[PDB]
């Protein structure tokens, strides 16, 4: 029994947080959360609207709001997220996951 997560990033490419926040050049002025903070977060922006996906796990969210928190809404929705779990470690997203 044991399947294994792969450990290949979705998007190798948007491993650099530096190139995560180049794609938040268009991130729109209706768009409440920062996106320093989601590229922090490993999401990086895709379309013109407020969609990300994490450039590991390539988990996509959107409909961003004031007070979201990126890193939490991360272990919200993809907990296995190899870099959320490197980053953030096991403790935090099974805070997350029991709430
Ligand atoms: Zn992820």
Same mark, same amino acid.
């Given at each position: 029994?044991? +399947?294994? #997560? %792969?450990?290949? =990033?979705? *998007?190798?490419?948007?491993?650099?947080?530096?190139?995560? #926040?180049?794609?938040?050049?268009?991130? !729109?002025?209706? +768009?409440? /959360? =920062? =996106?320093? #903070?989601?590229?922090?977060?490993?999401? @990086?922006?895709?379309?013109?609207?407020?969609? /990300?996906? $994490?450039? *590991? $796990?390539?988990?996509?969210? &959107? %409909?961003?709001?004031?007070?979201?928190? !990126?890193?939490?809404?991360?272990?919200?929705? @993809? !907990? %296995? $997220? &190899?870099?959320? #779990?490197?980053?953030?470690?096991?403790?935090? /997203?099974?805070? /997350? &996951?029991?709430?």
């Amino acid at each position: 029994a044991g +399947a294994t #997560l %792969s450990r290949g =990033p979705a *998007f190798p490419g948007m491993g650099s947080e530096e190139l995560r #926040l180049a794609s938040f050049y268009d991130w !729109p002025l209706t +768009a409440e /959360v =920062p =996106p320093e #903070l989601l590229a922090a977060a490993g999401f @990086f922006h895709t379309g013109h609207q407020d969609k /990300v996906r $994490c450039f *590991f $796990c390539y988990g996509g969210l &959107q %409909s961003w709001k004031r007070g979201d928190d !990126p890193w939490t809404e991360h272990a919200k929705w @993809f !907990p %296995s $997220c &190899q870099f959320l #779990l490197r980053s953030k470690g096991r403790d935090f /997203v099974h805070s /997350v &996951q029991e709430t």
